[PDB]
Amino acid sequence: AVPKFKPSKSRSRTRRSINMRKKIPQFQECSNCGNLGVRHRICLKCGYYRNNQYLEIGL
Amino acid sequence: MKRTYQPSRVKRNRKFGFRARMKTKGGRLILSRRRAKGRMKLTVSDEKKK
Amino acid sequence: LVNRRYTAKGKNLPSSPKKVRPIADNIRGESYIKAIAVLCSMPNKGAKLLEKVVKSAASNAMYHNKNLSEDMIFVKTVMVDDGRRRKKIWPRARGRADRLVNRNCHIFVEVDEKK
Amino acid sequence: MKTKLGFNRLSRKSSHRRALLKNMVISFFKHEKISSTKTKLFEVKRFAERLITRAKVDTVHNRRELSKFIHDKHILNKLFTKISPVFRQRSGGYTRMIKLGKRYGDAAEMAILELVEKPLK
RNA sequence: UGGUCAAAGUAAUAAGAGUCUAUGGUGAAUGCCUAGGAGCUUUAAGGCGAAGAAGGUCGUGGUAAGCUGCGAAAAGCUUGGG
RNA sequence: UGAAAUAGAACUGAAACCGUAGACUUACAAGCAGUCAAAGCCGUAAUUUAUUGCGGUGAUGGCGUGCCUUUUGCAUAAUGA
RNA sequence: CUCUAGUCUGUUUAAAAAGGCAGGGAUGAGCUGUGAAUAGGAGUGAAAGGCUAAACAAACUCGGAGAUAGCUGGUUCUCCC
RNA sequence: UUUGAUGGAGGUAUCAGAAGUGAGAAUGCAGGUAUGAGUAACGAAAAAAUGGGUGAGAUUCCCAUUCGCCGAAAACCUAAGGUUUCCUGGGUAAAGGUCGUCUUCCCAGGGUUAGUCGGCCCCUAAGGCAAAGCUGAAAAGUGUAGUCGAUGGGAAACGGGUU
RNA sequence: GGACGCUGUCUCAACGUGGAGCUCGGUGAAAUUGAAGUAUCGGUGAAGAUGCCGAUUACUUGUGGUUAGACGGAAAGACCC
RNA sequence: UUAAAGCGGUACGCGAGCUGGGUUCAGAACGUCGUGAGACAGUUUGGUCCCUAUCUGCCACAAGCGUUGGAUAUUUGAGAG
RNA sequence: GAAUACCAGGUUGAUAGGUUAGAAGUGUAAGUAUAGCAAUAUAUUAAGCUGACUAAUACUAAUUACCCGUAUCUUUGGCCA
Ligand SMILES: [Zn+2]
Question: Cα–Cα distance between D89 and D59 in angstroms, integer?
Fold first, then answer.
């Protein structure tokens, strides 16, 4: 239940690069402000979404 | 679990105090040794606890 | 190689380089707008740290080159190195203690005017 | 393989799930608009729309049922007097849940739940 | 000869990794230096204290945390020489 | 400011370790990772110029049981990092 | 309030000896607070080679002491006969 | 030993002498950094949720409304101990098993008023020291007259309010 | 040891509940570790082969499971001498 | 009872899968031997089964890539269970 | 169905939710009225309530959307010219 021999840097690198990989979220520019917002989410910069106000963005 | 250091105070001062050290020959040797080494604390009586 | 007029550097940031490198891979070579959007969207500590450094680099470039706006800039290079470490103790059973390393990272971003 | 479709169990035992649903529905009726995790809001609307359709018709017996779930008297009266009379006609879908993104810190999926038509004031 | 087609070879990919070249980060080894030590020589001094020692507590600073000095006259005072 | 700020709480700042960029090779293959041969690609010098060398990578072929200590005798699944 | 048969979790645990279930005692050879007395070839032990500051077939610290080992391990640059 | 980069202040020919004079290992020592691995855990199956305020920044701070838990306590008042951890204000290097505007974290300031409380005190239990006497190489060991030694016995207060 | 009653102890398991395990975000170890572009079978061999011979199989690289091996790790075997 | 209740190998298959009854610790008692301390494959009772899987191997699901224009569907079949 | 992948669907749509209705579970609700001192019973009432499934219904949610992605070249044969 313990490593038998230290793995090679190739194997460590391979595992690390494959696992520690985060995927980009999709985007779609807001119809109101033109910001690039996450697709299917309320715009975080102007608050609109499909031409409807839902937030009141502060500071 | 009740364990090794139930901290009394009368026991501390009576058993390990400066007067208890001076009270006999070996205690005075202890005091001389610690003075020679230059310890910052000679006895438990430097912890002002009565 | 560096046009050190156009770059930002953030030293000893509170995250591990192993955790910040993938986020850097996702924005290397992208346009500034796309990179800023990605970093704002993605909810990772490394994402926020890169966002600050990238924004600062773009600000420096704009300040020194007044005729360069937010949409001619693309993130040319991005480097994430490892920084100081601090060791603290995590005590376990039977009086055994373990040392519990906390890592920091340096972040270097250079922007450049788009193709 | 999964049996017991119809819940999300909201990651908590049955009594605490029921209490959760009751409190969030109360708050939703009180405030007309709330923000929370997407799963919690989904279950909340499944029950809130049911309560509204049960309260479409105002009678003593119906009110005494709705009290078995709404333990705030003020909000029970509000539900029977101010909210439903604007959904008297609508065949369903009184609420609207819209996603908000991944929250910083623990990356939960936030969302906003609100009424399609605001009630009488 | 051009095109289509059949046949036999071949170029163009690297999610990743391996090796050089150009570059950094992490780390503080090597080199250099000394604010402190070590081993001896040659002289001098070899005790202190009930006229209260050695060693400490407390307190004393325009303001100090520590050390040191000092002892409510408390990081000093008087006399004399420099 | 300073001779210097890859001299900004620190001189000279290597190795282990983590990276970036460029070049080459690799996804039909069983390599103590090395050596002896060797096509192609890239860098470079000569010979009027694409064939010989200094080079870095290397398809493919041949050979090859890490090291230390201890034993009549070890790749040994004896010992130690 | 004091004890631990049986069973289970735990056993790189929350705990260097618990906890989850249960059981015995429970007006007495009872539990317990607060002081004191017995120190190492000795003490104590309703007696198991137990305990005596989490380790006891002779405690711990200092000194003799760098004790002695027919035992094990290690012993660093090169060439020639 | 020659050319470069780096470095900015001491090294050193020839001959001769003297060693703490050459490391790859001793389950070596010291320090730094890989590996397992972004994996196990993140500490009990009493439970959180919404809104608002503060703040650059809030699922974790503050406030409010619900829900839940203990309730011969997981409550309150005093010991044994700790010794500023207490209060006000400011701040987030580290530290808090996460975040943090918060903390028993840090910095500054402030805070403990006794004839009636607890000690001190006058007394003694167990016990300790102990002139004299007696016994021992020394150092001491025994031990009377005495003197110390509380968890004990002895003069005195209750209610309410204020920071 | 046997009898009565009672039962998922068993033929014989299935379903449900709670804490982990699974994914993501933040924080973040341990023992082990000469390295590794480490396949198997039949043989040989310090006499049980990931490293040798012959032969066979196999696009490259992960994740979730289970330990058959690496005479696994842990304890200079407690048994014998 | 059944048509029949086979013989062997595989660390007398299989404890980093489970069980501790026995064997093989420290308790106690009995039998025998020894003056005794004790001894006895003589007997009876009580008496912790640790470890989160690195590689290989296997049970499954994917990522990348090739199949020589690039893709979307229907299938012949080596081979395997 | 562990994250996967496949599959269904995305305003040109019944994919999910809501709602309507049904297959069904519970077995006669609340309120009111009658009778009884009361407990309670009867009528209202195959009631009320729950409908993990099924069939409809755009009422709500799948957006006026973002990244990848084609006969290289040499030799020969056949057809066409
Ligand atoms: Zn917008």
Answer: 18
To what resolution in angstroms was this structure determined? 3.4
| Protein-contacted positions of strand F (CB under 7 Å) | 17-21
What is the token pair recorded at D21? 């649903």
CA of D88 and C1' of I78: distance in angstroms? 87
Method for this entry: cryo-EM
Helix (H, G, I), strand (E, B) or coil at D47: helix
Q: Which residues of C touch A18 (CB under 8 A)?
A: none
Residue with tokens 């793995």: A7
Q: D2: exposed, middle or buried (C-beta count within 10 Å: 0-12, 13-18, 19+)?
A: exposed
Cα–ligand 1 centroid distance for A49 (angstroms): 7
**Contact between chains at C21 and A38 (C-beta distance less than 8 A):** no
Judged by a CB distance cut-off of 8 A, whether residue D50 touches chain C is no
For residues C14 and A14, give the distance between their C-alpha atoms in angstroms, rounded to a whole number: 25
**Of D50, D20, D51, D52, which is closest to residue D36 (Cα–Cα)?**
D20
Please name the helix (run of DSSP H) or strand (run of DSSP E) that holds residue A11, with its range, or none: helix A9-19
Q: Which of A28, A36, A44 to mutate to test the interface with C (most CBs of C within 10 A)?
A: A36
Which residues on neighbouring strands pair with residue A38, listed in sequence order? A27
Query: How crowded is the C-beta side of C22, counted as CA atoms within 13 Å?
Result: 15
Q: How far is the CA of C83 from the C1' of G72 (A)?
A: 46
Judged on CB neighbours under 10 Å (0-12, 13-18, 19+), A29 is middle
